[PDB]
Amino acid sequence: AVDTAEQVYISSLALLKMLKHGRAGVPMEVMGLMLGEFVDDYTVRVIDVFAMPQSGTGVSVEAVDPVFQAKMLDMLKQTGRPEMVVGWYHSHPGFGCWLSGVDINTQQSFEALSERAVAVVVDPIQSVKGKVVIDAFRLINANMMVLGHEPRQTTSNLGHLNKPSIQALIHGLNRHYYSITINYRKNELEQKMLLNLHKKSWMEGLTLQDYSEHCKHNESVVKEMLELAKNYNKAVEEEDKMTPEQLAIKNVGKQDPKRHLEEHVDVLMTSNIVQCLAAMLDTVVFK
Amino acid sequence: LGSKNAQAIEDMVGYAQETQHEKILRGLAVGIALVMYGRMEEADALIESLCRDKDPILRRSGMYTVAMAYCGSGNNKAIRRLLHVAV
Amino acid sequence: MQIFVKTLTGKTITLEVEPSDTIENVKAKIQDKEGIPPDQQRLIFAGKQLEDGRTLSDYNIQRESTLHLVLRLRGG
Amino acid sequence: MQIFVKTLTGKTITLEVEPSDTIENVKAKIQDKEGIPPDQQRLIFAGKQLEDGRTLSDYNIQRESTLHLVLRLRGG
């Protein structure tokens, strides 16, 4: 019986390729094939993934060349990647994440060919800089479940940390299959890279901004301060003259000069400070 | 238990630091701390190792160690860091 | 005769066949062995696709040759 | 330069090797002397998992080291 705790480890490279491929077939369910190994009864690890030749019609897709797959795979071995197939993935734009209809059928034959298969679904159009939407599933048994048997065993809290969404319940996730938790496990060297990925050259740090143009910006903001001071005086004068929330509620059109006054500070400051400091340093370090 | 032992801590942190199964680490992350017990300042070297580690489960087991190293002492020097991690 | 057919998974199967058998009979034997439906599976030999309409002798399948099986990949 | 191998059964195998040998070679020697296919063998040495393409002196294995064989079972 399958343990509740078993993870899927995906290896950071695979994720980037899944996205850059999904966000291209913009309105179509592009698909691909996924390579890894079964470390253990509590694990599956995916290490790489690659696309295929395929065509579709908006309502469907499928791949057309079967030879290309075996040839590519057998080629890769000559350069240290002997790993084999463990699953497949396809992108759902904007729908959400679930398996539906045909996707179960092409899935289920994998499980007749290789138990412990995994189907992954990603959504590239809801995702945003903070977070990506990924899910990984496997089919519930082909019933004989009137027995009321649980699909899985549990001996940990480790699998009940997350709340299933309404959408997958609509399409029936716990009724026909089950979700499996995604986990990341970066190694040392790639994470050393990943922080360099934004560093910018020393050449720039010591450079001064032009002093002209800079003065122009200073005069621009200082002359912008006036109107805000003038408005601020009235805004101070008139408050508490009416009920408290009816201050804000009547201030949805016209701006409130406090914030616009305040946020022109942090522009005279910061700018003037850093420019004067940088000049003050480099006047010594060169001759 | 509690008998600090120069050799065994290496013979197990070396294994934990270089194996791929997770459950093994979730066992050892406790298995280490019991080699310290009330040893107050003595264990501090081991501490500064584990809390620097990249690997999340070793970074955790650092905390269990600094708990079992200072039972009941109320020593402020343990609190000041053991709480800073939470934040 | 004996024939070896292997899959993208790394599992391998051995079949017994006689030269007069057609490809369709091969696929039927595979379904009997594993439960994949005959319309899903594609076969490959010597780097070109198999098709029904022919006997296994016709492609000069020799004793103990190796075939590749690859599944239909559809989604929608 | 003697090496001890432990299998799952606990049988011990003795090897006369050289520090610049390669894992492919020792896996083959085991294949010769016991009959196990090379590619089913995985080698374990404390936590590290040994990779075929490089040499024992790269892992600074010493005399009479005890070294474990693990079998990657295959689906069927």
Added chain:
Amino acid sequence: MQIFVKTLTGKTITLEVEPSDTIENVKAKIQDKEGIPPDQQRLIFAGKQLEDGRTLSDYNIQRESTLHLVLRLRGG
């Protein structure tokens, strides 16, 4: 002068240096004594990790000071 360096197992090493000595010579002589490859290591004192270009005097290191060696135990 005599400085102390601690390793996790409770090993301590005492070492002879000079005020103007740089971190690189310290790592070199620890290599010469113990055989640790110079890169696999980090030195911690005052709760900070040192920078290889500075001198001990840059960090206000004083007599009989003890610092912690951090080690990737087996390297790989």
Added chain:
Amino acid sequence: AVQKVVVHPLVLLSVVDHFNRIGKVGNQKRVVGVLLGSWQKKVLDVSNSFAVPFDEDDKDDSVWFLDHDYLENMYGMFKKVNARERIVGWYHTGPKLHKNDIAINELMKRYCPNSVLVIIDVKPKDLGLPTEAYISVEEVHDDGTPTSKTFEHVTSEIGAEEAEEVGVEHLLRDIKDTTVGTLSQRITNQVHGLKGLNSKLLDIRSYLEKVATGKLPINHQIIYQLQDVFNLLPDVSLQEFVKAFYLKTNDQMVVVYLASLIRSVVALHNLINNKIANRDAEKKEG
């Protein structure tokens, strides 16, 4: 020809994966591969890559192996799944130039008349940037030395795509960053500037030792350049330049004074609101 080159993150992660994988086929200390890309208006963009078998007998130059008809075969297999991209150049992961790579370049140039080299050093030991770009040229000489075939430098940077930076940021859960505003300026553009400049001057310092009979003066060229450096550096800060400096410092600080004053008045105003509100409601609720 080329004025600049832009690299997408997918290439860097690919390089690192290759470097870690090779251990299953050899023991070498370098790896080599092909760059797929495109370009416009002399700005070159590299997007994708695959790695081809290579090998070299370390103890000599001129004895190395590089597999053509695997490269051609893969290039064919890729073209079938993305028509946008074409051979552009090659990369290797060594920390330093090697004697024979000009003789590699003269091979692979048969696949693209303009080919560019990118060094992607995978183990940095400093603050820095992970890539360098090189193009091949012919040099005349004034010494009458025969024409020399030699590399030349090209400026480089990392670029980005909206479909990837979502993934990069989903993965950048590792450490602190974004100490906002004035905090990030001085770190990013004073300290990490000075550390770089110092490393450069140490490098020149070391080279000028070897000329103590350790090595032949490589050219009077390099000495002419050094003399330009020490001649150009700004004049002694001793003349009426000083007057011009004080003027701007006064003007730079005056407006700071103004802004600070504004900053304090608002705090007083907020103070009053807090005070009255408190006491009134207190007496009311009592």
Added chain:
Amino acid sequence: DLYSRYKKLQQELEFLEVQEEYIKDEQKNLKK
């Protein structure tokens, strides 16, 4: 006993110190 009182107060002071440091750190981290 005056002595016990003295000691109690003494320690109390330190506990206050650590609490102040921790809440300062928290106030800085919640912005990020």
